[PDB]
Amino acid sequence: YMSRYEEITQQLIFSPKTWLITGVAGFIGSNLLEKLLKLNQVVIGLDNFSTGHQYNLDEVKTLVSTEQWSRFCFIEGDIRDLTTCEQVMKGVDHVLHQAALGSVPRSIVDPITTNATNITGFLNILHAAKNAQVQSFTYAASSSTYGDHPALPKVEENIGNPLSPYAVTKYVNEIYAQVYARTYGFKTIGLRYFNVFGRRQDPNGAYAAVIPKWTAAMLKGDDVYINGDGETSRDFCYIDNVIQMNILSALAKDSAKDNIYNVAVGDRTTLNELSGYIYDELNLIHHIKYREFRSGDVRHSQADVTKAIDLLKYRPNIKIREGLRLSMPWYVRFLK
Amino acid sequence: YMSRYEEITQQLIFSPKTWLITGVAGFIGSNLLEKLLKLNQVVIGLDNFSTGHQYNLDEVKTLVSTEQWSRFCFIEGDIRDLTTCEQVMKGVDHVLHQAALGSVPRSIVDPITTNATNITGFLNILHAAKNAQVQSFTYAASSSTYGDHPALPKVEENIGNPLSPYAVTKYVNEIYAQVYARTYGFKTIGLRYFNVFGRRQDPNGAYAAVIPKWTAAMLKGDDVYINGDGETSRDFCYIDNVIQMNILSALAKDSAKDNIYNVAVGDRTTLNELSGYIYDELNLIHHIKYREFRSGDVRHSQADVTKAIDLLKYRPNIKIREGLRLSMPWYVRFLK
Ligand SMILES: NC(=O)c1ccc[n+]([C@@H]2O[C@H](COP(=O)([O-])OP(=O)(O)OC[C@H]3O[C@@H](n4cnc5c(N)ncnc54)[C@H](O)[C@@H]3O)[C@@H](O)[C@H]2O)c1
């Protein structure tokens, strides 16, 4: 059961609102679009197809009715342009801001481009939303905001130094959100995502996340590379857990706003465990080498999600094996 | 005696280098230009004349010799354009990055342009500088970074939450700088300036700083606004102490780099005191009412400059009363 969550989605079904999703053509965005359209919401979407894909939009369309898709207004455009930000904001109740350039290695090769989309574009959306006086604003933050802080599990109040240009960008997101609360009274919720996975996560390109990458590699019969001894560990968070936290945040009482929340399960899985999980799941529906640790890699990562549970009534009910079970058939179809 | 500073300027005169000053037409940038040309350095200046002035460059021209002037190459341009940043970096040894749009209330009223000049512009310059392999990189940071930290005096390690968009941008400069050292080995110095004042600080405009605004006012015979009751206090730091810190930073030992330094004198002057010191200094060269409070603005500010004194051998020569005595003759000439 997902019960404050069930009650809210029930309520959305009876009383549609207007939502903005930036990054709507992307992994998390397109999953939010699918859920909102099935709740019969009115969705305004923004994307420049930098890392996102028309084919994601095309997939959502074949999963919703004609009438539900008629409530989707898609604008191809860039959050780095303030005018565009202000146009897509007209009439909007709830902002779900997911548009960013993720990937730590990307940000090291080209910090300029990562800065402009993740800081400039983020500020544009935050400032448009504040001017338009939307009901809520929730943005994608990042567990890389923990930086070099040694605590584990990671608790929201205790962060360290950021370790890459990417991490600076997501941290600045939070500090700006905080300043906007203070200066204009505009209260927002930042969501520190941890290793999100599930359908429509891109398995291609140099920056592919491990789950999609390894899944694609298993299905092609290509080498699955483990960086290190394999005892490195993550709190992998199935996509529905994130959808859940986004909707809970858009509809949070005022006292829950101007807050950061970890979004994860609270569990740790090793790379050695993961590899066996993926393989075991793929091989029910049909069809490895060790190398150097990646440089400047975090050894172990795990969220404390107590704050989300207590203040938003989050239930992290989809754990990693269930998540892989649910994600694997989408990869099988996509790759074949 | 500014002993180390003297020795370091002697090295420069014997073995001149190429310097980039961004913000060279502004208050601090033009004082840096003046000292560097007088040391026979080759100087590249970048400015967009947003808050800066041609008249500052014309004044400097009259103060240096012809040969010294012939070593100044001025480029009108914007740090928001990456290409421009790359071009003016060419053959540069030392970067003194001063270009920004200062002022807390400016940032509250336009956090967007402020974000673009002070974050994007900073990163463009930091990144161009890294790729050009400069010998050093020193940037204007801000005592606004202390935020709501309640401790006095202000110590570098101990900062609080940012209280304005401008505080955010100045802090983001430090965090980027720190990431560049960790990620690229590129070691910078950030100077948290505290209430600088001296010749060529603009007395005109909605954002004038208190010393020149009030000086202007008593020369015109206008009303002098003391916000609050007279007691509020600052660490006013005459411009020559800033020039010294810039030059010491540019030639610091490697272990002194990747560090933030308070740039001030360690003193605390009351508004009641200043209003008085200013009247007393002005009226020595011939020729009042209380009010409100502001927002983003602080009751008490005093720097601990131990760190600069110890690590760079900074010697804060000039205290507020003598700075004023030194500054007022420029203010008469400029207004009369
Ligand atoms: N995936 C994770 O595990 C993870 C971890 C930490 C943070 N995040 C954050 O989650 C959000 C979504 O990530 P994702 O996994 O869905 O990534 P994704 O790359 O699949 O989606 C991001 C979307 O943003 C769009 N976009 C990028 N720049 C844009 C711009 N300037 N204007 C308009 N659209 C732009 C892209 O086209 C893409 O459709 C991002 O903010 C990312 O930083 C994700």
Ligand SMILES: NC(=O)c1ccc[n+]([C@@H]2O[C@H](COP(=O)([O-])OP(=O)(O)OC[C@H]3O[C@@H](n4cnc5c(N)ncnc54)[C@H](O)[C@@H]3O)[C@@H](O)[C@H]2O)c1
């Ligand atoms: N005066 C103080 O007490 C104080 C305190 C804290 C920080 N600072 C910092 O000191 C630096 C210098 O300040 P100042 O007092 O000399 O201010 P100033 O306004 O006199 O100088 C700023 C200079 O930067 C130039 N500039 C601004 N944006 C630019 C851009 N986008 N491209 C190119 N040039 C641009 C302006 O034209 C100007 O000549 C700034 O970074 C400011 O944030 C000053």
